Design a protein around this ligand. Sequence first.
Ligand SMILES: Nc1ncnc2c1ncn2[C@@H]1O[C@H](COP(=O)(O)OP(=O)(O)O)[C@@H](O)[C@H]1O
Ligand SMILES: Nc1ncnc2c1ncn2[C@@H]1O[C@H](CO)[C@@H](O)[C@H]1O
Length: 345
Amino acid sequence: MSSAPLRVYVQCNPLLDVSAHVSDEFLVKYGLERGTAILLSERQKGIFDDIEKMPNVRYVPGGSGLNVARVAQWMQQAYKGKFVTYVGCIADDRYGKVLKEAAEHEGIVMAVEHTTKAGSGACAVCITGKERTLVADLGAANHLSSEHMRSPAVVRAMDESRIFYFSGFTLTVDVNHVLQACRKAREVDGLFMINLSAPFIMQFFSAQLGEVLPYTDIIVANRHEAKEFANMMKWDTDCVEEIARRAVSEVPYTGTKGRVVVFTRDIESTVLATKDGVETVPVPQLDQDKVIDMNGAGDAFMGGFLSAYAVGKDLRRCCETGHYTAQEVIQRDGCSFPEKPSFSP
Ligand SMILES: Nc1ncnc2c1ncn2[C@@H]1O[C@H](COP(=O)(O)OP(=O)(O)O)[C@@H](O)[C@H]1O
Ligand SMILES: Nc1ncnc2c1ncn2[C@@H]1O[C@H](CO)[C@@H](O)[C@H]1O
């Protein structure tokens, strides 16, 4: 006794994850802070050659938004092809084919661009225990064009979608692509949703972020991203609850659906805020010995949240569905799931 889900539009940078186990000395050798994500810089030249030379290196389709889409689609398997559409840029190369084929196999409509200006993007993922440390080399993802955003497939997708999710990571590419979707979302009275993605977005891309927030109905982030957001806004506060409250009322909002703020906190309760106050949603207890892979927990949470939102569940239940999905993924190496969910939103 379930609904068919509303159509969702997702946009991010499709990246192939190149993964390997690594010491702390290695992190420091390339100037990395453990458990964080950055964009490839000079300081990290050679890191891909170094990782590829290691044993049991894996090549796995990734990308934050793409993981979100896959998790959402996994929660709605009866609706392969009829649910999520994803937009990004790849190249027609080994990596690109892997990415496109995996997503399509799972039922995601890949409205992706193909460029020749660069090879399909990749992310170096450095495993140290349960923690992953990420270095993203966007390549082709960084060349997503206005032509592609004005194309028939994308405009049909936008026109027929009710829920729009962009990762914060898209802000490093071209803010105008994001603003175009913000406007279509308003045109159709849809929902626009964003992820803060990483502290560096607040530090180095606050201007771009600032253009998009007024259109953003739902803002999602984790504990660290929230503190960094407060720092960007110059808010003198040490509380995730207070930061969410201010994100509701003191961050400009030009929408009508109602601004909502969702901050996850790993083991601790998720903070959920609206103009009617601030609520917490407990995270079900889980034996930490079953927790194998912290990476992508946020992406999985997002997927659960969207899959519930698209069948019309209330916010609290959307967070509960997100907890369920995030807790499945962290119990497995990689972005991996049972055949079918055991949870009905
Ligand atoms: N160690 C853990 N034990 C149980 N659940 C976890 C754990 N870490 C994360 N989760 C689940 O994943 C969700 C997202 O986790 P969080 O770490 O806040 O996101 P991110 O991957 O952005 O760091 C949490 O709200 C929680 O439901
Ligand atoms: N800058 C980025 N843009 C898009 N995806 C990213 C970026 N940095 C890391 N990722 C993705 O984040 C995921 C972890 O949640 C990895 O699957 C990785 O591919």
